[PDB]
Every structure is written in C-alpha cells, then in structure tokens.
Amino acid sequence: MNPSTTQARVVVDELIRGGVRDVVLCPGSRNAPLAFALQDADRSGRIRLHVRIDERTAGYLAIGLAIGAGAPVCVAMTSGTAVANLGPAVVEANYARVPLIVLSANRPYELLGTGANQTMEQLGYFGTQVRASISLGLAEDAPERTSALNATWRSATCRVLAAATGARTANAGPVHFDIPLREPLVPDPEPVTPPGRPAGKPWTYTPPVTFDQPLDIDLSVDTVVISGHGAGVHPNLAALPTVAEPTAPRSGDNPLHPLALPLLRPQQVIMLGRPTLHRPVSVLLADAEVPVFALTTGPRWPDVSGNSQATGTRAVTTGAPRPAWLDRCAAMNRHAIAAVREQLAAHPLTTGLHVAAAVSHALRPGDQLVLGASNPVRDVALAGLDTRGIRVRSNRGVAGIDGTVSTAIGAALAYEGAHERTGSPDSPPRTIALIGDLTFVHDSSGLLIGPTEPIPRSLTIVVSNDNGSDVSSRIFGTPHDVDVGALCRAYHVESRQIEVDELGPTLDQAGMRVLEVKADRSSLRQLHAAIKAAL
C-alpha cells in the first residue's frame, strides 16, 4: 500500500472515530488519496459523503451539516485557490464557533517557490481565524516506521478534532488540517491499513471539558435578560423578562419584545451569548451607566457593552424580581406585539414582514428554522416568533450573504440524519428556510446537488422576493429581475410561486423545494414608521 493511500485511510478512519458523521468533498487530483478513502467510508456506511463543485458554498454546506446536529464536519478539497475559497466559511465558523475542519490536500512543501503548478502558501493561509493550523508530514516510504507513523498521524488528527470541537478550550471553531501528498496518489492494485485503538475508540481520548465560572447576581434589582447567538440555558433566570434573539435558546416563558426594551428603564442587564441583532439592544448596551453581566458558554465574551461588570458561565442568584417590574415588562411586551400585529393588518401590500409572520405562524414544534442573517432574522424577531421547541439556525457569526442556501441544505441533511438514528419512521422533521431574493440569487448555486449526492428529505426554502449613500448602492437602484423560477429550473429544484395566504397551507403539504412569495419593498419604511408610532 503506497504511502499516500496509507496516510489517507488512517486519517479518515481516525476522523470517523472522532465523531465525524458527514464530509463535504470537492473534486481534484491532489486530494485523490482523501477522495478514495472518503468514498470507501461512505460505501461502508461509516460516513455520509456530499460532493460539491464550488468550494466556497461547500464550506457553508459543511457549516450547515455541523449546526444541524452539533457534530464536527470536514470539508476536503485540492490545493490552490480551492483552499482560498474556504475563507468566507472559515470566518463565519470562527465567530459562530462552528467545528469546521478544512482538510486540504497540498503539494509537498518542498515545491513551494519552485513554480510548481497549482501551489501556494497554503499552511497559515487563514491566519488567526482558525483554532489551529496543523500539518501532517509528507508520508515517508518507511515500512519499519509504519507503527510510529500511524501513532503520529492519528495523534495529529485527534489534536485537530479537539481544537475544532473545543474539547479542551470550550471554544469550538474552524481548524486547518493541511496534508502534503505526492505521487502515487491513487491506490495500488490489490494484492492492511494500520489499525486504531481497540473498540473503535479515538487514538487519544479527550473528553468534552466542563467550563465553569459562577457569578453572583442579585435579581431584586430590576433586571432584563438579553440573549444572543450561542447563549446558554439558565433555569434560574427563567422568570426574568428576556429579549431573546431567534437563535438563542429560551430558558423560560417571560418574553420581552425587542421594541419594548427602549421604553423601559432596567437597572441592570444580564447578557447571554453574543447579542448583535437589535438596534435597541445595541443602543442600551451602549449606555455606559447600565451595569451588564455577561454569561457565556465559553471563554469569549462580547464587546458590545462597555459597562460589563463581570463575566461568568452561570448565575448564582439571590433575591427575586419585583412583582411590579415583572408586571410592567409583561405589559409592555403585550403592547409591542399588539402594535406590530395591528400595523401589519392595516398595511394593504405584502411586505417581507408579512411573509415572515406567516412563516412564523406556520411553524410547529420539532421544526428546524433556517434564517437568512439579514432581513429574515430581524423580521421573524419583529413578528415575535416563539422559538420554544423550534431549532433556529442562522449564520450570525459575521452575517454574510454567502452560502445561505447551502447552510439550509446542510442543516436539513444533518437534522434529518439525527432523526434517523432515533429509530422511527414517524416521518422526518421539517426544515423551513426564510431567505431574501438577493441572498437566494447570490447563493443559488448552493441549490446544485449532483444526481448521486444526498438530497434533503424535507426542506422548503421560502424566498421572500421584494426584487432587491455611496456610489456602490446604485446596484440597488433597480430590481435585479432575476427569474427565481428559472434559477430553480437550472439546478433542477422544484419551485412554486404563491401568495402569502397560500403559504401556511402549502407548508402543510416534494423533497427539497422553493416557495417564492412576491412582496413589496416600497411601502416598508412607512410600515416601520406606523409600528414605531403605535408604541
């Protein structure tokens, strides 16, 4: 067995032992050793392989596969700009703390600077965006060194997995795993792979760390909880008035609408996760006089407030909220919900806010909701969606528009896969995505799934199409006019154009499909004005 084939099979086996259930693969020749070993593992049923053509959107597919079920996910590609194309997903995975392993094949490092084809400064390309930049050695033809090389290869693979899942740091994120490879790149004619640990165990076992930092907080002070992306679950704060972003997990049943917050005067703030969504949240955390307490699941804590008194992972609570304060916040929340609902009905034309409210009402527990990181996530929060029992995904790391379609497809695939391991047909759970037309058009090639590749069993993408100071904004002066139906036809995906009233019934009833709901953009500044005035 030639060295490239031996090394690739060892790495793939150790990744599987580490909990990697899904791998994204992009075509090339230099990554052939990885592609062969990955195809074997898929044939054996040890992993599910997903082949894609465009490395950039393939990275967001891997992000979706990771956030859908919480497992580390590898994306593998050839040397050169294929690696550079993972840049956007790596940045998103860094700030959203997604265990994304970039498994890049490379020419031998000795060829760097020789003019060799398709070769570049690959290792270190991602800078400080990755949790680690790790290189295997070039595989030596040293059969007597086989046992030693098996240990070092599997150990390096375990270092990669630990860094990506945050097993020791509690700060999951992307990892660059560069593997220099040389000829022969394809397996030899048959006419054994060095084995891992017994019982399928990982070569170096590192259990998931428990990161703990308790913090004293007195709940008698009029307190509001603001929870953002990556927030933990705190039972002892469940009673408090909580402004929760759609991707934050709910700890209780005392919601406070984001619009209600600037109309109240909290005397202290408990901040969970990384809240970046709302402008009244940004405004209040900008107020240097309001003391803030930051509770995070990991060592990072957000910089959105300059008055963070302390950090922790959990609250040690004394006291209890004033009943008058609870009554006041509850009243203002009811008031904000009513204002939004009244103005929506009093608005004749369909807006993206209407589409978002319709999608919000159509959801039922067990659904997974994937939200475009710009308008959809804001609109759903404006419509006051109740996320309890719903799994809400959104690329809130840097909130780019790249890869939103691929992230939805990947999250559905991973979510449906976690259902299969339960044991049951009761049918696979629903994944519903809400994406704007510009985001959808930009990542429409994320729809492309080859005839041989896994297709989501129950994914519906709702496209809210409203047809779209510096000079670059002239691009928005005109509706783009892109035919969404033609786009879906191009990538052989079923699509239907429907009205908002039809959306709920149609979501009740194709595999993967796109439902396009036309909406109007002109009348919205007035609609938001009406909502604000009705508060």
Ligand X SMILES: C=C(O[C@H]1C=CC=C(C(=O)O)[C@@H]1O)C(=O)O
Map the footprint of ligand X across residues 102-141, applying CB under 6 A. Answer: 117-118
Q: Give 240's contacts (C-beta < 8 A, 6+ positions apart).
A: 219, 223, 224, 225, 252, 254, 270, 321
Question: CA of 121: how far to CAs of 112, 133, 188, 254, 482, in Å?
Answer: 7, 13, 30, 52, 38
Angle between helices 524-533 and 323-345 (to 10 degrees): 140
Residue with Cβ nearer Mg ion (251 or 360): 360
Residues between 429 and 488 with contacts to ligand TPP, criterion CB under 6 A: 436-439, 464, 466, 468
Using alpha carbons only, what angle is made at residue 478 by residues 475 and 481, rounded to the nearest 5 degrees? 105
Applying CB under 6 A, does 92 fall inside the site for ligand TPP? Answer: no
Angle between helices 375-382 and 352-362 (to 10 degrees): 70
Q: Residue 523 touches which of ligand X, a copy of itself, ligand TPP, none (CB < 5 to 8 A by kind)?
A: none
Applying CB under 6 A, does 245 fall inside the site for ligand TPP? Answer: no
Nearest Cα residue to 223 out of 248, 245, 240, 244: 240
Residue with Cβ nearer a copy of itself (125 or 415): 125
| Of the candidate residues 28, 173, 397, 456, the single one contacting ligand TPP (CB under 6 A) | 28
Cβ atoms of residues 230 and 93 within 8 Å: no
Could you tell me the smallest distance in angstroms from the CB atom of residue 503 to ligand X?
Answer: 25
Structure-derived torsion over alpha carbons of residues 423, 427, 430, 431, reported in degrees to the nearest 10:
60
Tell me the site size for ligand X, rule CB under 6 A. 8
**167, HSE (Cβ side, Cα atoms, 13 Å):** 16
Which pair of tokens denotes residue 113?
């600077």
Residues between 146 and 205 with contacts to ligand X, criterion CB under 6 A: none
Applying CB under 5 A, does 14 fall inside the site for Mg ion? Answer: no
Question: CA of 253: how far to CAs of 9, 239, 240, in Å?
Answer: 50, 7, 9
Q: Residue 368 touches which of a copy of itself, ligand TPP, Mg ion, none (CB < 5 to 8 A by kind)?
A: none
Cβ atoms of residues 20 and 47 within 8 Å: yes
Phi, psi of 224 (to 5 degrees): -120, 140
Applying CB under 8 A, does 180 fall inside the site for a copy of itself? Answer: yes
Q: Residue 204 touches which of a copy of itself, ligand X, ligand TPP, none (CB < 5 to 8 A by kind)?
A: a copy of itself
Applying CB under 6 A, does 33 fall inside the site for ligand TPP? Answer: no
Residues between 233 and 252 with contacts to Mg ion, criterion CB under 5 A: none
| Of the candidate residues 5, 6, 57, 78, the single one contacting ligand X (CB under 6 A) | 78
Tell me the site size for a copy of itself, rule CB under 8 A. 161
**Binding track over 30-69 against ligand X, x by CB under 6 A:** x---------------------------------------
Using alpha carbons only, what angle is made at residue 244 by residues 240 and 246, rounded to the nearest 5 degrees? 150
Residue with Cβ nearer Mg ion (79 or 465): 465
Residue with Cβ nearer a copy of itself (502 or 520): 520
Q: Residue 142 touches which of a copy of itself, ligand X, Mg ion, none (CB < 5 to 8 A by kind)?
A: none
Binding residues for ligand TPP, rule: CB under 6 A, are 27-28, 55, 78, 80-82, 85, 352, 372-376, 399-402, 436-439, 464, 466, 468
